[PDB]
């Protein structure tokens, strides 16, 4: 299934024989880099000392 | 005045369902075809428009 284009194909539609003509096979989601927290600056500063 | 065609509109099962996610997905499978069923009427729709 995994070894090229093509052979999704085959996989979608269980047939070695393939027909023309586009098929949709499977779905490309763009993969997230990271991540990103963003709070404010610190606001206060409980009386510790 | 006259209808002709519906403005062609796919919709990927698996992402709406799930969104974004993996241990989400694997619950989908165990419903079956579902999702490889309604891709495949919503292109016969979108096929025949
Ligand atoms: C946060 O700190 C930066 C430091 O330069 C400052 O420019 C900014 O205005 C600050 N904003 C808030 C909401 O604390």
């Known amino acids: 299934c995994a070894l090229d284009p093509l052979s999704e194909t085959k996989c979608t539609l269980k047939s070695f024989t393939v027909e023309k003509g586009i098929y949709q096979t499977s779905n490309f989601r763009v993969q997230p880099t990271e991540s990103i927290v963003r709070f404010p600056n610190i606001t206060n500063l409980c009386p510790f000392g | ?49």
């Open chain 2, 1 to 49: 005045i006259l209808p002709v065609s519906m403005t062609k509109t796919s919709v990927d099962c698996t992402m709406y369902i799930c969104g974004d996610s993996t241990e989400c997905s694997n619950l989908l499978l165990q419903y079956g075809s579902f999702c490889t069923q309604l891709n495949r009427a919503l292109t016969g729709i979108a096929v025949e428009q």
